[PDB]
Design a protein around this ligand. Structure first.
Ligand SMILES: *[C@@H]1O[C@H](CO)[C@@H](O)[C@H](O)[C@H]1NC(C)=O
Lengths: 49, 49
């Protein structure tokens, strides 16, 4: 078993001054309307209908 | 924008809607354009004269 071939893949992640290009998945809750709710559409934390 | 003229660009107004966005983050100070020339049967086909 120890002499059998094994495939090894190594992942490396680095940070530079460039804007981030690789991002993980995001979640999305259901849209409720005509009610005083709070939303955050990527630019503001607005509360309202 | 379609137009029917050779020179002396018209005084009409036409805004420029945005196009694709490049998140590169590099240095830039110089630029140059690219042109296309034709090699028909009239020309000998050499890029000298
Ligand atoms: C190019 O960008 C780098 C960092 O973004 C900066 O240090 C450098 O001075 C820039 N070069 C020029 C010619 O502006």
């Amino acid at each position: 078993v120890g002499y059998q071939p094994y495939r090894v893949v190594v992942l490396s992640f680095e940070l530079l001054h460039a804007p981030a290009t690789v991002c993980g998945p995001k979640k999305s809750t259901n849209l409720v309307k005509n009610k005083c709710v709070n939303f955050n559409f990527n630019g503001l934390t607005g509360t309202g209908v | 924008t379609p137009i029917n003229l050779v020179r002396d660009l018209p005084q009409g107004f036409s805004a420029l809607e945005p196009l694709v966005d490049l998140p590169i983050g590099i240095n830039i100070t110089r630029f140059q354009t690219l042109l296309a020339l034709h090699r028909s049967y009239l020309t000998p086909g050499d890029s000298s004269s």
